[PDB]
Amino acid sequence: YTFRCLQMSSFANRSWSRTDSVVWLGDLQTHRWSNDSATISFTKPWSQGKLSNQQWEKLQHMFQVYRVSFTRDIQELVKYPIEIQLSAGCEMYPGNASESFLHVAFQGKYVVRFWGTSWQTVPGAPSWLDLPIKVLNADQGTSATVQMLLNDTCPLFVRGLLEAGKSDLEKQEKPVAWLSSVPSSAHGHRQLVCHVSGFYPKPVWVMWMRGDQEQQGTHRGDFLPNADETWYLQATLDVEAGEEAGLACRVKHSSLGGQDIILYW
Amino acid sequence: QKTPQIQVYSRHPPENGKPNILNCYVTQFHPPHIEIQMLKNGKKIPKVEMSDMSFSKDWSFYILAHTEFTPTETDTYACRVKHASMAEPKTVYWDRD
Ligand SMILES: CCCCCCCCCCCCCCC[C@@H](O)[C@H](CO[C@H]1O[C@H](C(=O)O)[C@H](O)[C@H](O)[C@H]1O)NC(=O)CCCCCCCCCCCCC
Ligand SMILES: *[C@@H]1O[C@H](CO)[C@@H](O[C@@H]2O[C@H](CO)[C@@H](O)[C@H](O)[C@H]2NC(C)=O)[C@H](O)[C@H]1NC(C)=O
Ligand SMILES: CCCCCCCCCCCCCCCC(=O)O
Ligand SMILES: *[C@@H]1O[C@H](CO)[C@@H](O)[C@H](O)[C@H]1NC(C)=O
Ligand SMILES: *[C@@H]1O[C@H](CO)[C@@H](O)[C@H](O)[C@H]1NC(C)=O
């Protein structure tokens, strides 16, 4: 599981800026924090994890001060349109192991990370960042706080989320599939489409088949989100008209027990 | 600066006359400022819900719009996007097939 906190800050000029944040645990949103809101909003029953109200309030306060300081520091540095994104969190591995990260992009490009005990520019980042990053590193209060958040608080908080959020994280939702076709660009050919929607979790197997034989022309699309915390995917096959007979789409998913969906064209 | 990609798809198998949900998934764009409309027969659908703006590992932004709809033999549905990266709004039509 990758836990990520995403910050999106836009500065249009000296007197217009906003920052919005969202937080994900794998593919499930756990928090939102609008520019218009003083406080971080929960998007799950279990968004506080195992933290007490006191621990949560202390954490939220730290972020409230950060959001204000960050905006002031950027407007100060700029002495437009500027887009800054920050992605921070941790990847949780089997056996209580984790790895934390904090990356920053400027104008859509990765330029800075926090690594170990300091802020570092990435090779290729513009040279004008070297000095402000130096100055930032002089702020040992901030460096120590970031170290604690990354090394300590992040994995601790996520362990709690994983417990508290068990019934959602471990949910199984069954795919429903259906078949369609369109003419292809190419006289006498058709594109067959197998649509698979409503499944959770994400891992799925979808193949066009002729009997036991996988059709290697099967072209899987991207995973597309539904609005109800389930997934959508389609897989297409270009066929010569005539050759359509005998084809099936087969889908395997954890929620199906061990009974694959097979639809026949 | 990156141009939005748009994909339009239904939550459930479409059946004419049966209520469903139409999704418009907009991806790969930068900057995050975007306008997304969903249209029925060329007219704006008033009740459209939007996900919170988020971004991927490659830093590009994405957003999911969705609306209740009931497919019909003759009604056309589309998702129309305006973004700084494009001189003209981009429209993609839902195609059940
Ligand atoms: C054209 C501009 C391009 C910029 C390019 C990118 C810039 C790199 C971005 C580097 C991040 C800037 C961090 C600055 C934050 C500090 O100003 C802030 C305030 O520091 C002051 O107050 C502190 C306090 O009261 O807590 C300390 O006392 C400190 O000594 C004092 O100087 N520091 C903090 O708020 C500390 C904790 C912040 C954690 C930073 C990571 C947050 C990421 C969380 C994920 C998303 C959250 C929305
Ligand atoms: C947070 O973890 C980082 C990464 O392990 C620590 O930075 C390391 O500190 C050790 C021990 O002093 C050094 O030997 C390494 O050089 C540092 N690692 C890297 C990759 O830079 C950091 O000290 C930890 N901070 C806290 C407060 O626990
Ligand atoms: C150095 C900052 C890195 C961020 C890691 C944060 C670890 C604490 C986890 C608390 C996350 C709760 C969501 C709040 C974050 C937000 O709203 O932006
Ligand atoms: C700053 O940007 C905002 C939002 O784009 C805009 O409304 C405002 O006119 C700008 N202010 C100035 C001084 O140009
Ligand atoms: C975002 O919130 C800040 C702090 O409350 C506020 O000053 C600013 O006007 C808000 N941004 C916008 C564009 O609404």
Report on the structure:
It is classed as immune system. The entry lists the keywords NKT cells, MHC-fold, bacterial antigen. The assembly is dimeric. The complex is a heterodimer of chains A (265) and B (97). In chain A, strands 4-3-2-1-5-6-7-8 form an 8-stranded antiparallel beta sheet. In chain A, strands 9, 10, 13, 14 and 15 form a 5-stranded antiparallel beta sheet that branches. In chain A, strands 12-11-16-17 form a 4-stranded antiparallel beta sheet, with no helix packed on it. Chain A has helices spanning 53-77, 130-137, 140-164, 166-169, and strands at residues 2-13, 16-25, 28-33, 41-42, 82-93, 97-106, 109-115, 118-121, 176-183, 189-199, 204-210, 213-214, 219-220, 224-225, 231-240, 247-253, 261-264. By secondary structure, chain A is an alpha+beta fold. Chain A folds into 2 domains: 1-170, Murine Class I Major Histocompatibility Complex, H2-DB, Chain A, domain 1; 171-265, Sandwich (Immunoglobulin-like), CATH 2.60.40. In chain B, strands 1, 2, 5, 6 and 7 form a 5-stranded antiparallel beta sheet that branches. Chain B has one domain (1-97): Sandwich (Immunoglobulin-like). In chain B, 0% of the residues lie in helices and 51% in strands. Chain A binds chain B through residues 6, 8, 10, 20, 22, 24, 29, 32, 81, 83, 85, 87, 105, 108-110, 176, 178, 180-182, 193, 195, 197-198, 222, 224-228, 232, 234, and chain B through 1-2, 7, 9-13, 21, 23, 25, 30-33, 49, 51-55, 59-61, 64, 66, 95-97.
